[PDB]
Design an enzyme around this catalytic site. Structure first.
Site, PDB file in Angstrom:
ATOM      1  N   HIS A 165       0.824  -1.203   0.000  1.00 58.23           N
ATOM      2  CA  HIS A 165       0.000   0.000   0.000  1.00 58.23           C
ATOM      3  C   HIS A 165       0.866   1.265   0.000  1.00 58.23           C
ATOM      4  CE1 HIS A 165      -3.574   2.482   1.230  1.00 58.23           C
ATOM      5  NE2 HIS A 165      -2.619   3.194   1.800  1.00 58.23           N
ATOM      6  N   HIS A 223       1.635   4.059  -3.068  1.00 57.80           N
ATOM      7  CA  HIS A 223       1.325   5.480  -2.908  1.00 57.80           C
ATOM      8  C   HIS A 223       2.308   6.367  -3.674  1.00 57.80           C
ATOM      9  CE1 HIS A 223      -2.181   6.543  -0.757  1.00 57.80           C
ATOM     10  NE2 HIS A 223      -1.863   5.982   0.395  1.00 57.80           N
ATOM     11  N   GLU A 257      -5.998   6.328  -2.372  1.00 56.47           N
ATOM     12  CA  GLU A 257      -5.994   5.255  -1.386  1.00 56.47           C
ATOM     13  C   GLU A 257      -6.505   3.942  -1.984  1.00 56.47           C
ATOM     14  OE1 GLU A 257      -4.628   5.470   1.511  1.00 56.47           O
ATOM     15  OE2 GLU A 257      -4.220   7.623   1.418  1.00 56.47           O
TER      16      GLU A 257
HETATM   17 ZN   LIG Z   1      -2.748   5.234   2.215  1.00 58.86          ZN
END
Ligand SMILES: [Zn+2]
Ligand SMILES: *[C@@H]1O[C@H](CO)[C@@H](O[C@@H]2O[C@H](CO)[C@@H](O)[C@H](O)[C@H]2NC(C)=O)[C@H](O)[C@H]1NC(C)=O
Ligand SMILES: *[C@@H]1O[C@H](CO)[C@@H](O[C@@H]2O[C@H](CO)[C@@H](O)[C@H](O)[C@H]2NC(C)=O)[C@H](O)[C@H]1NC(C)=O
Ligand SMILES: *[C@@H]1O[C@H](CO)[C@@H](O)[C@H](O)[C@H]1NC(C)=O
Ligand SMILES: *[C@@H]1O[C@H](CO)[C@@H](O)[C@H](O)[C@H]1NC(C)=O
EC number: 3.4.24.11
Length: 696
Positions: free
Chosen positions: A530, A534, A593
């Site tokens: 994750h 980003h 996200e």
């Molecule tokens: Zn995040």
């Protein structure tokens, strides 16, 4: 071939208790993975949101309570100060006995609050200016009203600091609230009633007469004014492109483009900016380069501010100041916020004093508290294992570049280059434990009093602003951490191109040495993916390997990125949330996200498959009839188990850049071929749509 240790037993029990085996995994994996969690973990009356993350954060506060509440003879000065601060905070008897006096004594500093002043124009009107008023609230208290000014990193020059100008946030969670209709109706009413009630309390304590109708007139005028300002702000959807937001210009050009008339007089940007920077003795000339994030907002401000008096403007600015301080005063002042808090969060009471105080001290002395936390609760042996996982997932990202057909060859090389340059931060900065002198020196200028909590928090606000403003002529410190260690979260920094995993998140269900590899990869593994991803989402992809906002994409690949990502905008935007009264997720604001979620879980699973290929299969867990491929996705989902109060669901759907855990689970797994293979989902079951989104 079944694990029998006490560690495996409670690990299995946790998984079993949280899931609902009566639910069909391929119809709704959230209900399958978190159904039991929902029945088991009713939202606390003091919680607006409850989840795995929130539970871990509550448990961390208990640890902070233990290591802050009792003085020890060998405590270094930095620790002594943290404990004195904590002690001042939890002494409610001392706080209650002071009523509203600490606030009332301080109010002149911000030119008072007209509605609660005997004669505001007489006392403050003579020396008042918008330049000086906004500047004082900014430079001393960090309260940003009308115009946001801050010293931060230069987007295009990541080693330098520079002044930024932007639109401010509002009293209500977002600009949408100021429609004050439907789901926003109660919030607006409670907001204005909140103003009135506090105005009455302060006037009563000052020994002034109470005119109910007159106060109501002034406070409704405050709302009228803030409505116009809210309407003037640019939507969050139109602020996700960092390239478009960056407008560098000189202070002289700012004065030229963004003139303002207040009380018949012209607003001086030179005066405003220097009223702020003089607090740290820095002069700002007209040739100063400045980054302006919201030019459209500043223009729209022109016809608004002329229509209001200094009393009107100061009534708003001082209210924005006062509303965040009232909960640090006596019980009567605390209670004035009750209806307002409920409207925005659904909570019936403020959380426990010791919990708030533990969090407050952590927020203001993150190194001192991070030190106490890690010595009490963090196994340093964890760091090297996490290091290895990061290496694996970084390499998986790079290998995956070959599979992606929507990128041309040279953009792939540049992407690999940025991936290789990513720097990691794990656990805590060693200095906070290994170097007492440096830690003590950090807090040298701070001096707290045992029985003056409000004075201590005022000291902290000034210190925090002064420290940031002083950086304007200094280079960015590369080694400085962007989070405290006693934090249950993880981060990616565009400006530093680094990924950070504080000690607080290195625990079950994310990670444990006493936890199956399937669970570890499904947990902290997915989180690592994750954060890495980003660096390549709709925001991150605009920054290069050294943290500079520069275009390293070909036109075709950039166009293809936007096309691939548009799929996720539609996917999540189409999600309707029952807790928020059927409101839809914001597909644009949550895009970044969602890109990171979808990329990360795929990277983590691939890394896990590679691990099994080289090291073999793992022992099964007792009482759970699932293989480890399935346990990977089960643990991933249980990382995001949680629920919301209706009032806060509405709040978060308009302010949170993340999707709710419910849809992070559904959204990411809908796009996962590997998930549907693991649970043998039929094509076009809800969890296995034949049309899937893919970026990374
Ligand atoms: Zn995040
Ligand atoms: C929000 O601001 C916009 C302008 O930024 C307002 O739109 C103007 O409304 C007036 C009166 O209806 C018109 O005469 C103008 O032509 C409009 N301008 C634009 C650019 O649309 C809008 O009315 C404001 N809304 C609220 C609720 O205050
Ligand atoms: C600040 O104002 C200047 C002057 O109007 C803007 O520069 C002009 O931009 C237009 C197009 O937007 C050009 O046609 C003019 O030739 C420009 N004039 C000058 C003197 O440069 C500038 O864009 C404004 N800045 C912002 C951020 O809006
Ligand atoms: C809290 O403050 C009161 C008043 O100053 C004082 O009497 C009391 O001892 C304090 N409590 C503690 C635990 O120090
Ligand atoms: C801003 O203007 C006022 C009045 O014109 C002046 O007294 C003050 O010194 C100015 N501020 C700065 C920082 O120069």
């Amino acid at each position: 071939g079944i694990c029998k240790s006490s560690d495996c037993i409670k690990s299995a029990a946790r998984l079993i208790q949280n899931m609902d085996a009566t639910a069909e995994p391929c119809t709704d994996f959230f209900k399958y993975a978190c159904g039991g969690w929902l029945k088991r973990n009713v939202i606390p009356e003091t919680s607006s949101r409850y989840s795995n993350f929130d539970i871990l954060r509550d448990e961390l506060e208990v640890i902070l309570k233990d290591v802050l509440q009792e003085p020890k003879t060998e405590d270094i000065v930095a620790v002594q100060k943290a404990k004195t601060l904590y002690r001042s905070c939890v002494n409610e008897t001392a706080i209650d006995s002071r009523g509203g006096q600490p606030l009332l004594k301080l109010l002149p500093d911000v030119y008072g609050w007209p509605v609660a002043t005997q004669n505001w124009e007489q006392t403050y009107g003579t020396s008042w200016s918008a330049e000086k008023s906004i500047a004082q609230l900014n430079s001393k208290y960090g309260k940003k009203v009308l115009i946001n000014f801050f010293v931060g990193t230069d987007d295009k020059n990541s080693m330098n600091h520079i002044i930024h100008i932007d639109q401010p946030r509002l009293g209500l969670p977002s600009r949408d609230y100021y429609e004050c209709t439907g789901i926003y109706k109660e919030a607006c009413t409670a907001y204005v009633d909140f103003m009135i009630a506090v105005a009455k309390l302060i006037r009563q304590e000052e020994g002034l007469p109470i005119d109910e109708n007159q106060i109501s007139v002034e406070m409704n005028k405050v709302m009228e004014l803030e409505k116009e300002i809210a309407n003037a702000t640019t939507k969050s959807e139109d602020r996700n492109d960092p390239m478009l937001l960056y407008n560098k210009m000189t202070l002289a050009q700012i004065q030229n483009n963004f003139s303002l008339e207040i009380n018949g007089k012209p607003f001086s940007w030179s005066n405003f900016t220097n009223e702020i920077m003089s607090t740290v003795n820095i002069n700002i000339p007209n040739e100063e380069d400045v980054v302006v994030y919201a030019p459209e907002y500043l223009i729209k401000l022109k016809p608004i501010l002329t229509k209001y008096s200094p009393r009107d403007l100061q009534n708003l600015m001082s209210w924005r100041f006062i509303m965040d301080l009232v909960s640090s005063l006596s019980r009567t002042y605390k209670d004035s916020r009750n209806a307002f808090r409920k409207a925005l969060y659904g909570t019936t009471s403020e959380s426990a004093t010791w919990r708030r105080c533990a969090n407050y001290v952590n927020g203001n002395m993150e190194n001192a508290v991070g030190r106490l936390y890690v010595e009490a609760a963090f196994a340093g042996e964890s760091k090297h294992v996490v290091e290895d996982l990061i290496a694996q997932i970084r390499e998986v990202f790079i290998q995956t570049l070959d599979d992606l057909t929507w990128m041309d060859a040279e953009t792939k090389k540049k992407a690999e280059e940025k991936a290789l340059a990513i720097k990691e931060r794990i656990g805590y900065p060693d200095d906070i434990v290994s170097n007492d002198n440096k830690l003590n020196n950090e807090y040298l200028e701070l001096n707290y009093k045992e029985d003056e909590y409000f004075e201590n928090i005022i000291q902290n606000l000034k210190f925090s602003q002064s420290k940031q403003l002083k950086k304007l002529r200094e280079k960015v410190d590369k080694d400085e951490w962007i989070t405290g260690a006693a934090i249950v979260n993880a981060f990616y920094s565009s400006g530093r191109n680094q990924i950070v995993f504080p000690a607080g998140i290195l625990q079950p269900p994310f990670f444990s040495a006493q936890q199956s590899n399937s669970l570890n990869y499904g947990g902290i593994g997915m989180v690592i993916g994750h954060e890495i991803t980003h660096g390549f989402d709709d925001n991150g992809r605009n920054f290069n390997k050294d943290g500079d906002l520069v275009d390293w994409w070909t036109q075709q690949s950039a166009n293809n990125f936007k096309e691939q990502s548009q799929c996720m905008v539609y996917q999540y935007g189409n999600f309707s949330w029952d807790l928020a009264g059927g409101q839809h997720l914001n597909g644009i604001n949550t895009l970044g996200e969602n890109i990171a979620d979808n990329g990360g879980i795929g990277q983590a699973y691939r890394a896990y498959q590679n691990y099994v290929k080289k090291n073999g299969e793992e022992k099964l867990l007792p009482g759970i009839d699932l293989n480890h491929k399935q346990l990977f996705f089960l643990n991933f989902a249980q990382v995001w188990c949680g629920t919301y109060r209706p009032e806060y669901a509405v709040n978060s759907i308009k302010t949170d850049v993340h999707s709710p855990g419910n849809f992070r689970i559904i959204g990411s797994l809908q796009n996962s071929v590997e998930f549907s293979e693991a649970f043998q989902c039929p094509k076009n079951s809800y969890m296995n749509p034949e049309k899937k989104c893919r970026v990374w």
